[PDB]
Design a protein around this ligand. Structure first.
Ligand SMILES: CC(C)c1cc(C(C)C)c(S(=O)(=O)O)c(C(C)C)c1
Length: 134
């Protein structure tokens, strides 16, 4: 077992706050914001040895990233940014930093009660997305 096993499973989005403003701050275009904001994704998290895989499945896009903690990788985001990503564990929280074009955003994933809580931060703007077990 690892502690990261707490994240493993299939999760469904049940609430989203301030996601449009987060996307605006990130630089997402109008039409993409509207369609992505409407999405109600499932997040599927799995672990196999040192490799963590996070999938997002929705009517908008199906994305998948696989990574090793602390080890940088190239990611193409759902809004088609090409970013350099590093994901680490900090006191039980998965911290995902994306860097592109001199900009940076941080996505934190944490377990709270029976929920998985995702905090998306771009400068001073924070969006909170809450998922429950599917
Ligand atoms: C449009 C961009 C900024 C975006 C889209 C999505 C989905 C709606 C595909 C997500 S997430 O996969 O729901 O966490 C996320 C997370 C990783 C913040 C970001």
């Amino acid at each position: 077992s690892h502690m990261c096993d707490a994240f493993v499973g299939t999760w469904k989005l049940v609430s989203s706050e301030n996601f449009d403003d987060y996307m605006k701050e990130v630089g997402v275009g109008f039409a993409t914001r509207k369609v992505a904001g409407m999405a109600k994704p499932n997040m599927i998290i799995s672990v196999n040895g040192d490799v963590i895989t996070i999938k997002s499945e929705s009517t908008f896009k199906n994305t998948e990233i696989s990574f090793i903690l602390g080890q940088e990788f190239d990611e193409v985001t759902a809004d088609d940014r090409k970013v350099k990503s590093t994901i680490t564990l900090d006191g039980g929280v998965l911290v995902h930093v994306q860097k592109w074009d001199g900009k940076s955003t941080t996505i934190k994933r944490k377990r709270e009660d029976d929920k998985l809580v995702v905090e998306c931060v771009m400068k001073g703007v924070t969006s909170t997305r809450v998922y429950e077990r599917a």
